[PDB]
Amino acid sequence: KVYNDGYDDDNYDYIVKNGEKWMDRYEIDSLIGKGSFGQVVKAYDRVEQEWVAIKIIKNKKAFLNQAQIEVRLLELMNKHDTEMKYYIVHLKRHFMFRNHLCLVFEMLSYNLYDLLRNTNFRGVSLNLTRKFAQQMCTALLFLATPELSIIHCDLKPENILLCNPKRSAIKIVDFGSSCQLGQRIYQYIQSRFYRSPEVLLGMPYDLAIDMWSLGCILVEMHTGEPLFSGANEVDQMNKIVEVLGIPPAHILDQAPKARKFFEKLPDGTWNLKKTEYKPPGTRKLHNILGVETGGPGGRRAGESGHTVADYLKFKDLILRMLDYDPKTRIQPYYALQHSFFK
Numbered sequence: 547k548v549y550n551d552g553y554d555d556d557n558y559d560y561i562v563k564n565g566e567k568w569m570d571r572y573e574i575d576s577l578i579g580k581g582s583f584g585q586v587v588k589a590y591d592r593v594e595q596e597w598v599a600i601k602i603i604k605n606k607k608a609f610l611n612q613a614q615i616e617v618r619l620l621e622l623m624n625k626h627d628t629e630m631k632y633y634i635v636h637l638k639r640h641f642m643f644r645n646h647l648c649l650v651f652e653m654l655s656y657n658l659y660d661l662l663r664n665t666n667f668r669g670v671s672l673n674l675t676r677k678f679a680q681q682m683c684t685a686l687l688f689l690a691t692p693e694l695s696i697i698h699c700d701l702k703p704e705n706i707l708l709c710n711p712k713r714s715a716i717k718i719v720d721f722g723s724s725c726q727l728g729q730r731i732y733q734y735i736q737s738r739f740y741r742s743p744e745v746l747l748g749m750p751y752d753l754a755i756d757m758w759s760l761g762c763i764l765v766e767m768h769t770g771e772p773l774f775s776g777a778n779e780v781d782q783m784n785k786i787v788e789v790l791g792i793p794p795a796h797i798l799d800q801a802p803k804a805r806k807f808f809e810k811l812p813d814g815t816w817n818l819k820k821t822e823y824k825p826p827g828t829r830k831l832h833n834i835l836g837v838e839t840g841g842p843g844g845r846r847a848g849e850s851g852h853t854v855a856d857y858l859k860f861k862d863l864i865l866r867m868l869d870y871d872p873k874t875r876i877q878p879y880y881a882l883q884h885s886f887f888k
């Protein structure tokens with residue numbers, strides 16, 4: 547009939563009303579986002595005199611506990627990321643308000659998907675992509691801090707916001723799926739398009755799964771379309787094999803879900819199970835980026851900083867991020883030393 551004395555709807559969300567004033571501080575403007583966790587609203591903090599994004603967690607134990615995990619990680623990064631120099635969204639504050647946990651973040655701009663949609667999904671320049679690549683590798687280096695060792699676990703263009711629509715700075719948001727390194731508890735993780743092979747294959751994983759997501763994300767930012775846009779896990783792996791080929795046998799010989807996608811023939815080698823797709827490794831990233839044809843779709847012909855030399859340095863870094871072996875995959879410190887950033 548009525549939930550939380552009328553403050554919540556039937557699925558535990560707080561009914562947001564534009565113009566409401568919380569605790570004589572926050573002036574709720576409008577709803578800017580929704581999710582399984584709850585809602586995100588645009589509000590004006592009057593003590594600090596600034597716009598803020600408030601994350602109102604649903605009035606439900608499951609989502610309340612998931613948010614305290616998120617708060618513990620965010621505050622743990624504030625102890626290390628003083629002055630906010632590592633491109634992580636800053637948690638300012640949190641409080642309870644009418645049985646909902648509220649998290650106050652800095653008011654950020656559009657996400658990288660919004661930006662891509664406004665190119666009609668054909669990408670931004672390689673010079674801007676380099677600016678995002680350097681900032682993302684730097685944030686991943688921060689999460690790699692030994693005392694942190696944080697896996698974001700859901701990197702994707704929507705989880706990366708611009709600070710100011712007039713500036714090329716980006717921030718990583720939404721650490722509700724995030725966990726610190728440790729013994730394996732979850733296996734169905736990451737967004738599918740950006741899910742690493744060790745996750746698809748049911749193998750142990752570490753912080754290197756975020757480096758895989760980045761490689762897919764960076765290519766997507768320049769071409770406009772997801773690199774591996776699988777409609778399911780079988781389709782996903784098949785689109786990975788198109789570009790990178792069959793994974794190594796010493797990995798597949800260990801993968802618990804190897805046979806969900808592959809088959810071992812009598813001769814001891816692995817091949818794709820029949821389900822369409824190009825032969826393994828013939829959708830070359832060289833051609834996807836259009837290294838020698840003027841970029842994706844030839845749309846970058848004649849633009850400065852889009853030479854074959856530049857594309858070859860971008861391709862090399864990406865291929866280091868899309869390494870099948872998570873122990874060989876490039877690490878943030880090394881990625882930042884790459885020639886693509888000189």
Ligand SMILES: COc1ccc(N)cc1-c1cnc(N)c(C(=O)c2cccnc2)n1
Pocket residue numbers: 578579580586599601635651652653654655656657707719720721
């Ligand atoms: C345009 O910005 C958004 C659009 C949709 C949604 N759902 C959220 C945002 C947005 C804007 N500013 C923010 N600071 C944030 C977040 O900090 C954020 C995003 C996802 C999950 N938790 C916090 N999120």
